[PDB]
Amino acid sequence: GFKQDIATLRGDLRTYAQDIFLAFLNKYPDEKRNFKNYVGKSDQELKSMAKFGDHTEKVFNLMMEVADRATDCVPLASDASTLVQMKQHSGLTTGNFEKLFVALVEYMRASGQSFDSQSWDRFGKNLVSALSSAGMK
């Protein structure tokens, strides 16, 4: 289920982080607008770019910690707060996070693997609510 999924993702985190973040940017091409340098690059080009690698792995490092501290796919209010207050997320709305989770869930459904995609879907919906409750627009 959900906890094992965190261990699976963490076991090849750089590849899953890139692959899911690219699924997100390809499903919602308007999202690349929140990152300048990303426009007009193919997936392989993005994976070469130092700042794509180091951003995307930090997103997934922290997202897995938030998942690991959750109870029954409900994240801690402290983790929502942290995500809201980050200077780098100033322009962001709960919509940006919804779309990341929809891509993550569709990635897991299309994989050959026994990911608990329904728990990830609940986790994303609970994280979106937490973010709103913590102050995100």
Q: Interface residues with ligand HEM (CB under 6 A)?
A: 31, 34-35, 51, 54-55, 58-59, 62-63, 88-89, 92, 96-97, 100
Judge whether 51 is annotated as a binding position: yes
Q: Which residue's CB is nearer to ligand HEM, number 28 or number 112?
A: 28
The least CB distance from residue 112 to ligand HEM, in Å, is 24
Residue count of the chain, please give it: 137
Q: What is the dihedral of CA 82, 85, 89, 94, to 10 degrees?
A: 80
Q: Which residue's CB is nearer to ligand HEM, number 5 or number 31?
A: 31
Residues in CB range of 21: below 8 A, 6 or more apart: 52, 56, 59, 60, 100
Judge whether 96 is annotated as a binding position: no
C-alpha angle 111-117-123 in degrees, rounded to nearest 5: 140
The least CB distance from residue 66 to ligand HEM, in Å, is 6
The least CB distance from residue 100 to ligand HEM, in Å, is 4
The least CB distance from residue 62 to ligand HEM, in Å, is 4
Judge whether 26 is annotated as a binding position: no
22 with 43: CB under 8 angstroms? yes
Judge whether 88 is annotated as a binding position: yes
Strand, coil or helix: 71: strand
Which one, of 51, 47, 20, 54, lies nearest residue 35 by Cα? 51
Judge whether 36 is annotated as a binding position: yes
Residue ranges at the known binding site: 36-37, 51, 55, 58, 88-89, 97
